[model samples]
Target: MVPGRSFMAVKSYQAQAEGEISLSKGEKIKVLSIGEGGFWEGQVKGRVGWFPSDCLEEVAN
Candidate 1:
Protein backbone atom coordinates (compact mmCIF):
# COMPACT_ATOMS: atom_id res chain seq x y z
CA MET A 1 0.00 0.00 0.00
CA VAL A 2 1.10 3.56 -0.61
CA PRO A 3 2.48 5.57 2.24
CA GLY A 4 1.18 9.03 3.22
CA ARG A 5 -2.37 8.05 2.48
CA SER A 6 -5.59 8.28 4.43
CA PHE A 7 -7.16 5.43 6.40
CA MET A 8 -9.86 4.79 8.95
CA ALA A 9 -9.64 3.00 12.24
CA VAL A 10 -11.61 -0.22 12.37
CA LYS A 11 -11.45 -0.44 16.15
CA SER A 12 -10.53 1.59 19.17
CA TYR A 13 -6.89 1.66 20.40
CA GLN A 14 -5.38 3.27 23.42
CA ALA A 15 -2.16 5.22 23.12
CA GLN A 16 0.94 3.34 24.24
CA ALA A 17 3.36 6.30 24.29
CA GLU A 18 3.55 10.07 24.34
CA GLY A 19 3.76 10.34 20.61
CA GLU A 20 0.99 7.90 19.98
CA ILE A 21 -2.59 9.10 19.82
CA SER A 22 -5.58 7.05 20.87
CA LEU A 23 -7.85 6.00 18.04
CA SER A 24 -11.58 5.44 18.16
CA LYS A 25 -13.47 3.36 15.65
CA GLY A 26 -14.07 5.30 12.40
CA GLU A 27 -11.41 7.90 13.18
CA LYS A 28 -9.45 9.18 10.22
CA ILE A 29 -5.67 8.83 10.02
CA LYS A 30 -2.81 9.35 7.64
CA VAL A 31 -0.52 6.38 7.11
CA LEU A 32 3.19 6.94 7.28
CA SER A 33 4.51 3.42 6.72
CA ILE A 34 4.16 -0.23 7.60
CA GLY A 35 6.33 -0.86 10.60
CA GLU A 36 7.85 -3.94 12.16
CA GLY A 37 5.84 -6.31 14.37
CA GLY A 38 2.58 -5.99 12.43
CA PHE A 39 2.18 -2.31 13.28
CA TRP A 40 1.60 0.69 11.11
CA GLU A 41 3.16 4.13 11.50
CA GLY A 42 0.42 6.72 11.19
CA GLN A 43 -0.62 10.25 12.05
CA VAL A 44 -3.78 11.04 13.93
CA LYS A 45 -4.78 14.53 15.01
CA GLY A 46 -1.24 15.59 14.08
CA ARG A 47 0.33 13.06 16.50
CA VAL A 48 2.60 10.49 14.93
CA GLY A 49 3.27 6.94 16.12
CA TRP A 50 2.68 3.25 15.54
CA PHE A 51 -0.58 1.32 15.93
CA PRO A 52 -1.75 -2.20 15.15
CA SER A 53 -2.24 -2.68 11.42
CA ASP A 54 -5.33 -4.79 11.94
CA CYS A 55 -7.09 -1.76 13.40
CA LEU A 56 -6.98 0.24 10.20
CA GLU A 57 -8.53 0.17 6.74
CA GLU A 58 -7.68 2.28 3.70
CA VAL A 59 -9.98 5.20 3.05
CA ALA A 60 -11.80 5.21 -0.24
CA ASN A 61 -11.00 8.03 -2.58
Candidate 2:
Protein backbone atom coordinates (compact mmCIF):
# COMPACT_ATOMS: atom_id res chain seq x y z
CA MET A 1 0.00 0.00 0.00
CA VAL A 2 3.05 2.26 0.43
CA PRO A 3 5.32 3.59 -2.27
CA GLY A 4 8.01 1.13 -1.21
CA ARG A 5 6.42 -2.21 -1.97
CA SER A 6 9.36 -4.52 -1.31
CA PHE A 7 10.57 -2.24 1.45
CA MET A 8 8.85 -1.30 4.72
CA ALA A 9 9.42 0.53 7.99
CA VAL A 10 12.39 -0.77 9.95
CA LYS A 11 11.50 -1.11 13.59
CA SER A 12 14.31 0.00 15.86
CA TYR A 13 14.20 -0.11 19.62
CA GLN A 14 15.99 2.41 21.80
CA ALA A 15 19.12 1.19 23.64
CA GLN A 16 19.68 -0.94 20.59
CA ALA A 17 23.30 -1.97 20.24
CA GLU A 18 25.33 -0.75 17.33
CA GLY A 19 25.64 -3.29 14.57
CA GLU A 20 23.89 -3.30 11.24
CA ILE A 21 21.49 -0.45 10.67
CA SER A 22 19.81 2.02 13.03
CA LEU A 23 17.72 4.89 11.80
CA SER A 24 15.25 5.19 14.67
CA LYS A 25 11.92 5.10 12.84
CA GLY A 26 13.62 6.75 9.95
CA GLU A 27 12.51 5.10 6.69
CA LYS A 28 11.50 1.79 5.25
CA ILE A 29 14.30 -0.73 4.78
CA LYS A 30 14.50 -3.55 2.32
CA VAL A 31 14.72 -7.00 3.90
CA LEU A 32 17.36 -9.14 2.33
CA SER A 33 17.63 -12.30 4.45
CA ILE A 34 16.23 -13.71 7.67
CA GLY A 35 18.66 -15.18 10.18
CA GLU A 36 17.54 -17.74 12.79
CA GLY A 37 18.12 -15.31 15.66
CA GLY A 38 15.05 -13.41 14.45
CA PHE A 39 17.57 -11.02 12.99
CA TRP A 40 16.78 -10.24 9.42
CA GLU A 41 19.64 -9.12 7.22
CA GLY A 42 18.51 -5.71 6.06
CA GLN A 43 20.00 -3.10 3.83
CA VAL A 44 19.22 0.58 4.15
CA LYS A 45 20.34 3.24 1.74
CA GLY A 46 23.61 1.51 0.77
CA ARG A 47 24.58 -0.20 4.05
CA VAL A 48 23.76 -3.82 4.80
CA GLY A 49 23.36 -5.47 8.20
CA TRP A 50 20.98 -7.32 10.55
CA PHE A 51 19.13 -6.63 13.77
CA PRO A 52 16.69 -8.06 16.26
CA SER A 53 13.33 -8.91 14.76
CA ASP A 54 11.52 -5.99 16.33
CA CYS A 55 9.91 -5.34 12.97
CA LEU A 56 8.61 -8.86 12.66
CA GLU A 57 4.95 -8.79 13.64
CA GLU A 58 3.93 -10.99 16.52
CA VAL A 59 1.42 -13.17 14.83
CA ALA A 60 -0.42 -16.20 16.19
CA ASN A 61 2.08 -18.31 18.05
TM-score of every prediction relative to native: 0.70, 0.50
Candidate 2 lDDT (Cα, whole model)? 0.54
Per-residue lDDT of model 1, residues 1-61, tens digit only: 5476688888878888765667778878788867567677787776678778778887874
Candidate 1, overall lDDT?
A: 0.76
- Per-residue CA lDDT of model 2 for 23-42, tens digit only, reads 34555566677667656766
Q: Count the backbone clashes (under 3 Å) in each candidate.
A: 0, 0
Residue 9 accuracy (lDDT) in model 2: 47
Q: Under the 3 Å rule for N, CA and C atoms, how many clashes does model 2 have?
A: 0
